[PDB]
Amino acid sequence: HCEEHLDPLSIYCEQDRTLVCGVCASLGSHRGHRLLPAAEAQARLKTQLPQQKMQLQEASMRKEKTVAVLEHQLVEVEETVRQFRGAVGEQLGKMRMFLAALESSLDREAERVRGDAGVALRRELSSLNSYLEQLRQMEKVLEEVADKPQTEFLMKFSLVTSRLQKILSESPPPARLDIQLPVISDDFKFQVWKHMFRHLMPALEELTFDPSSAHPSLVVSSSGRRVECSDQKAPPAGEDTRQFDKAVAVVAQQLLSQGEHYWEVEVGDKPRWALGVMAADASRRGRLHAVPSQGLWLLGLRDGKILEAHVEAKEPRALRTPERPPARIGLYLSFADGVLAFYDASNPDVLTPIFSFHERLPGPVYPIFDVCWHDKGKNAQPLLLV
Amino acid sequence: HCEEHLDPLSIYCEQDRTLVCGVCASLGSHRGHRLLPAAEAQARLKTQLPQQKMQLQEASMRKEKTVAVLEHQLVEVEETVRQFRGAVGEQLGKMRMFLAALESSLDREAERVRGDAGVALRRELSSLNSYLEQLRQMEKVLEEVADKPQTEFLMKFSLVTSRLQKILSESPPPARLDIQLPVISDDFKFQVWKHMFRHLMPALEELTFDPSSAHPSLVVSSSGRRVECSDQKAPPAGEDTRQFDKAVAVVAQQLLSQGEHYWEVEVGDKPRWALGVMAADASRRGRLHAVPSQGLWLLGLRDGKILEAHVEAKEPRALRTPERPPARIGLYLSFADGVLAFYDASNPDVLTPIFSFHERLPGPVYPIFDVCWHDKGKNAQPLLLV
Ligand SMILES: [Zn+2]
Ligand SMILES: [Zn+2]
Ligand SMILES: [Zn+2]
Ligand SMILES: [Zn+2]
C-alpha cells in the first residue's frame, strides 16, 4: 500500500521515520539509510509510546504556562492603563481646581466692587432726589402764593428762604475710600502661571528642629522652629552618633523616606549658612566633606553674597547668585524622581530655582540645617523654620 | 394771630426774616433788631421774588447735573465690571483649554497603547490555543492507536513525531511580551506647568520678510520664510529710507502696532545674528546705532557662543550664555505692558528666558532681523521664520 510505488508497506526508515516499500528503499527515498522491518519497528514503538505521551504533556504544559502569563499580562495592561488615565485626571484636576478657585475669587472681587459703588451712588441719588422734590415744592409754592394776603405771603416767603438756605448750606457726604478694582491687561495669564507653582508644591512638611541632635553650642526655641548659635562657650557634646561635634548644625526629628515633600527656611541677612538633607546613616563627626557620596546634599551661601552648591567635586560649585542675598530658601524633595531642588522663596508668590541634585536617593534622610559658626559674633543670625 | 402774645402780625425782622407782633419786637426775641413793617416788607419781597426763583433754578440745575453724572458713573461701573469679568474669563480659558487638550491627547495615546497591546496579546493567545488544540489531538491519537495495523500504527506514530518536532522548532517566545507602559510620576505636574507657558503665548505671528526693505546682498526665499546673505556681489541699494543699504538686515512685511504678538525665528548654528524690533519712524539707512533711543530693540549673538543684548548704553550688555548655542529664538511683544521678551526656543515645547526689554514702546515697530554678513562665506547660515 505504498500508493507511490505500489508495494506493500514493510520497510521502516529510522533516520527518515516513515514506513515505506521496497523500491523506494532500493532506488528511491532511502537508498543509503538505516532501515528496519515493520514488525520490530512496531514492537519498538509500542514501547516508545510512554516517552511520546510524556513529551506531549510537557509541551502542552509549557504552552499553557505561556498562555497563563500572557493573560495575566493582559489584565496588568488594562489595570496600568486605568491607573495612568486616573492619575492624569487627578494631577490635571489639581491645576484646573486652582484655576476655578482663582476665577471665583476674582468674581467675588468684581461683585463686591460693583455692590459698594452702587450703594454709595444710590445713597447720593436718594439724597439728591429728595432735594429735587424739596426744590420743586419751593418753586411751585412760591409761584402759587405770590398773590396771597400779606400775612400768608411773608410767612411762606420766610419759610421758603429758610428751607432753601439750609439745603444749600448742607454738609456734603463724608469721606469714603474707593475700592478701585485693579484691572488685568496682558501679563495676568503669565502671573497666574507664575503663581500656580507654589500650589503645585506639596503641602508644607511641618518640621521641628531636634535639640536631641543639635550642637551643644546651639539653642533651639519657638517649639522646634528657631535655631541659633551663641556668643558663649559650651560643654563638649556627649558621645553620640546623634550629635554634631565640630560643624554647628542640627537635623529635624522627622525622617523623610517616601513620597514628595517641601519645606521653607528663613535665613534673612545671614552671611554664611548651609541647607539641605543628610543621609540618616551618615556620620556627624569632624569637619565634614560636602559630597553626595557621603550622604550630604547641601546648598550654601558665604561672605554674604557668594552662593555655593556642595556638588561632588574638589570644591563646591558656584551658582549665579540673585540680585540679593536670598532671604528665604525653599527645598523640594522627591524619591520617585530622586531630586532635591532649591528655590529663592523670598517672594511668597513666585519661587525661582537655585540648584537641584539628581541622584536616586538611598534613603531615608533627615532635614539638615547648618547654622554656621560663631565667627566672633558676626554670624549671630538665626535659622527660622517656616 | 401771634398765638403766643395774641396780636396780629405786622413787624418783619430784617436780620431774622420773620413776621412778629409788637411786644416780641419791643422787648423780646427781636427787641434789638432792625425791624420793618409788613407793608414795605411785602413790597420789597414781591420784587425780590424773581431773583429767588432764579437762584432756585440754579440750585436745581446743579443737583440735576450731579444726578446725571452719578447715573452715568453707575452705568460705567457696570460696564467696567463686565469687561473685567470677560478678560479674566478669556485669559483663564486659555489655560483651561491647554489643560483639556493635553489631557485628551494623553488619553488618545494611552488608548492606542492599550489597543495595540490587546491585539498583540490576543494574537499570541490564539497561536498558543491552536497549539494546545493540536497537542490535545496528538494525545488523543496516541492514546487511541496502540493496536492498529502495521501501516496505520507506524504511519500515525511517525506523523505524530514529525508534528511534535515541527511545533517544538516553531516555538513562540516562552516569555512575556514587552509593553513599555506609560507611568505617571511626581514630575508630571511640573512638566505640564512648564509646557503651559508656550501655550500661554498668543498665536504665532506668522511673518514674512519684506524684500522691498532688505539689503541688496540678501535673498528672500521659501515664500517669505527664509532670508540669506550671498557669496557674490549685488547692485548697490536703491534710493529708499525703506531699504537697508549698509547694515545687512530686513524687516517683516507686517507692521505691529497694537495688542500682543509672538514669533519664533530658527537660527540653528548661525554664529552671528541679531533679532528684535525697529520703530517704523526709524531710518533704515547708513550704519545704525543699536540703542532703543534710536528705535532699535535688538538681541545679538557673535562668535557662535557670545550672547549680548544691545541695551541703551555705550557698550552692549553681556548675557549668560547657555550650555548650548540656542537653535531657535522666541520673541514676544506687548504694548499694553511695554515688554519685548526673548526666549531660547531650541525646545519648541519648553521656553527658557534670555532677555526682556521694559518700556512702554513709542510704537509702532516692524520685526527686524539682522542676518549678518557673509564673513567670507563662513557665516552663510540663513534666518528661518517659523
Ligand atoms: Zn529515509
Ligand atoms: Zn515505495
Ligand atoms: Zn408777639
Ligand atoms: Zn429778630
Q: How far is CA A249 from CA A9, A231, A245, A308, A341, in A?
A: 97, 16, 9, 17, 20
**Whole-angstrom Cα distance, residue A366 to residue A212?**
13
Has A372 been labeled as part of a binding site? no
What burial class does residue B276 get, using C-beta atoms within 10 Å of its C-beta: 0-12 exposed, 13-18 middle, 19+ buried? buried
Please, which residues have CB within 8 angstroms of residue B122's CB and are 6 or more apart in sequence?
A: A74
Interface test with A, best of B84, B105, B356 (most A CBs within 10 A): B84
Task: State the count of interchain CB pairs (< 8 A) between A and B.
Answer: 283
Handedness of CA B339, B340, B344, B349 (dihedral sign): positive
- Cis, peptide link before residue A364, omega less than 30° from 0: yes
**Strand, coil or helix: A176:** coil
Rg, C-alpha atoms of chain B: 46
- What is the maximum alpha-carbon separation in chain A? 165
**Whole-angstrom Cα distance, residue A65 to residue B250?**
70
Handedness of CA B213, B215, B216, B219 (dihedral sign): negative
**Whole-angstrom Cα distance, residue B301 to residue B145?**
88
Residue type, A226: R
**Whole-angstrom Cα distance, residue B308 to residue A308?**
26
Go through chain A and list every residue after which a break occurs, taking a C to next N gap over 2.5 angstroms, comma-separated.
none
**Whole-angstrom Cα distance, residue A249 to residue A218?**
8
Residue type, B308: E
Residue type, B169: S
Query: What's the order of all strands across the beta sheet hosting A328-334?
Result: A218-221, A226-229, A383-385, A260-266, A328-334, A339-344, A352-358
Q: How far is CA A377 from CA A218, A384, B29, in A?
A: 13, 18, 84
> Are the C-beta atoms of B243 and B209 separated by less than 8 Å?
no
- Give me the helix-helix angle, A38-144 and A188-200, nearest 10°: 130
For domain A199-385, the CATH class is: mainly beta
A262–B contact, CB cutoff 8 A: no
> Are the C-beta atoms of B292 and B338 separated by less than 8 Å?
no
Rg, C-alpha atoms of chain A: 45
What burial class does residue A64 get, using C-beta atoms within 10 Å of its C-beta: 0-12 exposed, 13-18 middle, 19+ buried? middle
Cell of B45: 419781597
Locate cell 450703594: which residue? A119
Rounded to the nearest 10°, the torsion over CA B199, B203, B208, B212 is: -120
Determine the residue of chain B that is closest to A199 in CA distance. B189
Determine the residue of chain A that is closest to B116 in CA distance. A77
Residue type, B2: C
**Whole-angstrom Cα distance, residue B87 to residue A5?**
95
> Are the C-beta atoms of B282 and B296 separated by less than 8 Å?
yes
Q: How far is the CA of B8 from the centre of ligand 4 (A)?
A: 17
- Cβ–Cβ contacts within 10 Å for residue B125, how many? 15
**Whole-angstrom Cα distance, residue B222 to residue B208?**
9
> Are the C-beta atoms of B306 and B315 separated by less than 8 Å?
no
DSSP state of A146: T
Please tell me the distance in Å from A55's CA to the nearest CA on chain B.
9
B52–A contact, CB cutoff 8 A: yes
| Ligand nearest to the CA of residue A8, numbered in listed order | 2
* Residues with C-beta atoms within 5 A of ion ligand 1: A 13, 16, 30, 33
> Are the C-beta atoms of B373 and B248 separated by less than 8 Å?
yes
The arrangement of secondary structure in B200-385, i.e. its CATH architecture, is: Sandwich (2.60)
Task: State residue A78 phi and psi, 5-degree precision.
Answer: -60, -45
**Whole-angstrom Cα distance, residue A367 to residue A384?**
13
Cell of B180: 513599555
B176–A contact, CB cutoff 8 A: yes
A268–B contact, CB cutoff 8 A: no
Cβ B189–A94 below 8 Å, yes or no?
yes
A141: part of which helix (H) or strand (E)? helix A38-144
B99–A contact, CB cutoff 8 A: yes
Cβ B132–A64 below 8 Å, yes or no?
yes
> Are the C-beta atoms of A49 and A56 separated by less than 8 Å?
no
> Are the C-beta atoms of A230 and A373 separated by less than 8 Å?
no
Q: Which residues of B touch A121 (CB under 8 A)?
A: 70-71, 73-74, 77
Interior angle at CA B13, CA B9 and CA B14, nearest 5: 145
Has A21 been labeled as part of a binding site? yes
The candidate with the shortest Cα–Cα distance to A316, out of A294, A338, A301, is A301
**Whole-angstrom Cα distance, residue B212 to residue B243?**
6
> Are the C-beta atoms of A21 and A10 separated by less than 8 Å?
yes
Interface of B with A in 324-353 (CB under 8 A): 334, 336-337, 339
A153–B contact, CB cutoff 8 A: yes
Cβ A117–B74 below 8 Å, yes or no?
yes
Please, which residues have CB within 8 angstroms of residue B314's CB and are 6 or more apart in sequence?
A: none
Please name every residue paired with B219 in a beta bridge, in sequence order, or none if there are none: B228
The 10 Å CB-count burial string (b at 16+, else e) for B182-215 is eebebebbbebbbbbbbbbbbeebebebbeebbb
A44–B contact, CB cutoff 8 A: no
Please tell me the distance in Å from B209's CA to the nearest CA on chain A.
27
Rounded to the nearest 10°, the torsion over CA A61, A66, A68, A69 is: 140
Q: How far is the CA of A162 from the centre of ligand 3 (A)?
A: 20
Q: Which residues of B touch A161 (CB under 8 A)?
A: 17, 52
B38–A contact, CB cutoff 8 A: yes
The candidate with the shortest Cα–Cα distance to A294, out of A309, A315, A314, A279, is A279
- Cβ–Cβ contacts within 10 Å for residue B54, how many? 10
Q: Which of B111, B113, B320 sits opposite A320 (nearest CB)?
A: B320
Q: How far is CA A46 from CA A52, A56, A230, A299, in A?
A: 10, 16, 98, 82
Has B229 been labeled as part of a binding site? no
Cell of A47: 514501547
The candidate with the shortest Cα–Cα distance to A111, out of B81, B70, B92, B73, is B81
Q: How far is CA B248 from CA A168, A224, B219, in A?
A: 74, 66, 11
> Are the C-beta atoms of B193 and A197 separated by less than 8 Å?
yes
Q: Which of A80, A128, A196 sits opposite B63 (nearest CB)?
A: A128
Q: Which of B151, B175, B190 sits opposite A1 (nearest CB)?
A: B151
Q: How far is CA B96 from the centre of its chain?
A: 13
> How many residues would you count in chain B?
386
Cβ B154–A94 below 8 Å, yes or no?
no
Q: Which residues of B touch A118 (CB under 8 A)?
A: 74, 77
**Strand, coil or helix: B341:** strand
B164–A contact, CB cutoff 8 A: yes
Q: How far is CA B30 from the centre of its chain?
A: 79
Q: Which residues of B touch A173 (CB under 8 A)?
A: none
Q: How far is CA B88 from CA A129, B85, B261, in A?
A: 37, 5, 19
Interface test with B, best of A45, A116, A350 (most B CBs within 10 A): A45
Please tell me the distance in Å from A253's CA to the nearest CA on chain B.
25
Cβ A337–B183 below 8 Å, yes or no?
no
Q: How far is CA B224 from the centre of its chain?
A: 24
**Whole-angstrom Cα distance, residue B169 to residue B126?**
18
Please, which residues have CB within 8 angstroms of residue B84's CB and are 6 or more apart in sequence?
A: A106, A110, A181, A183, A184
Cβ B132–A67 below 8 Å, yes or no?
yes
Q: How far is the CA of B165 from the centre of ligand 1 (A)?
A: 16
**Strand, coil or helix: A165:** helix
Interface of A with B in 218-247 (CB under 8 A): none
> Are the C-beta atoms of B270 and B281 separated by less than 8 Å?
no
**Strand, coil or helix: B19:** strand
Q: Which residues of A touch B181 (CB under 8 A)?
A: 77, 80-81, 84
Has A147 been labeled as part of a binding site? no
**Whole-angstrom Cα distance, residue A53 to residue B4?**
141
| Ligand nearest to the CA of residue A35, numbered in listed order | 1
**Whole-angstrom Cα distance, residue B59 to residue A326?**
62
**Whole-angstrom Cα distance, residue A182 to residue A166?**
40
A40–B contact, CB cutoff 8 A: no
Go through chain B and list every residue after which a break occurs, taking a C to next N gap over 2.5 angstroms, comma-separated.
none
Cell of B108: 488618545
Cell of A160: 421758603
Rounded to the nearest 10°, the torsion over CA B231, B233, B236, B237 is: -20
Q: Which residues of A touch B88 (CB under 8 A)?
A: 103, 106-107, 184, 188
What burial class does residue B233 get, using C-beta atoms within 10 Å of its C-beta: 0-12 exposed, 13-18 middle, 19+ buried? exposed
The candidate with the shortest Cα–Cα distance to B260, out of B198, B331, B332, is B332
Interior angle at CA A305, CA A301 and CA A310, nearest 5: 30
